[PDB]
Amino acid sequence: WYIQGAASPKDMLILVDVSGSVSGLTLKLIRTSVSEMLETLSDDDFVNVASFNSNAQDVSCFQHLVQANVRNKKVLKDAVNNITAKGITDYKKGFSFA
Amino acid sequence: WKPFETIILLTIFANCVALAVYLPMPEDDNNSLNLGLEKLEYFFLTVF
Ligand SMILES: [Ca+2]
């Protein structure tokens, strides 16, 4: 209730950095922030989740911004969890894909 | 004669600073100074 009147609905898009340097304590922290970030999202809010390491793939099956209802968010919170860090960081292919 | 004994003693001190400034990163991840430092290794590999 606080959130819907805080602000206007929003199409967000979470990028996740999956380069090798992140693996460790930091990688562990990211999977819990994104799940946390989602809690914030609402049905009126659309959201997808991407991830980059020298190529930007998209974390799940979706490929476009989806309604971020209870179900869709459940899919994204279940694909954020299985991520493995490997590879070169590329912020240019990560923001092109975004 | 005199300085070839001391330019190759100065080359080797420059090879020990290039091993020092290397920064090891996990999982094959590299910043841009580690890439220019493996281009220095080739130049230190032929002088020796
Ligand atoms: Ca990195």
Among A62, A52, A54, smallest CA distance to A18 is for A52
Structure tokens at B35: 């890439």
CA of A20 to the centre of ligand 1 (A): 6
B26-46 burial by CB neighbour count: b if 16+ within 10 A, else e?
Answer: ebebbeeeeeebeeeeeeeee
Is residue A60 part of an annotated ligand binding site? Answer: no
Among A69, A21, A15, A27, smallest CA distance to A45 is for A69
Q: Rg of chain B over CA atoms, in angstroms? A: 13
CA of A68 to the centre of ligand 1 (A): 29
Method: cryo-EM
| CB-CB under 8 Å, B29 with A89 | yes
Among A80, A65, A95, A68, smallest CA distance to A33 is for A80
Stated resolution in angstroms: 2.9
A71-98 burial by CB neighbour count: b if 16+ within 10 A, else e?
Answer: ebbeebbebbeebebbbbbbeeebeebe
Among B13, B48, B21, B26, smallest CA distance to B38 is for B21
C-alpha A33: how far from its chain's center?
Answer: 9
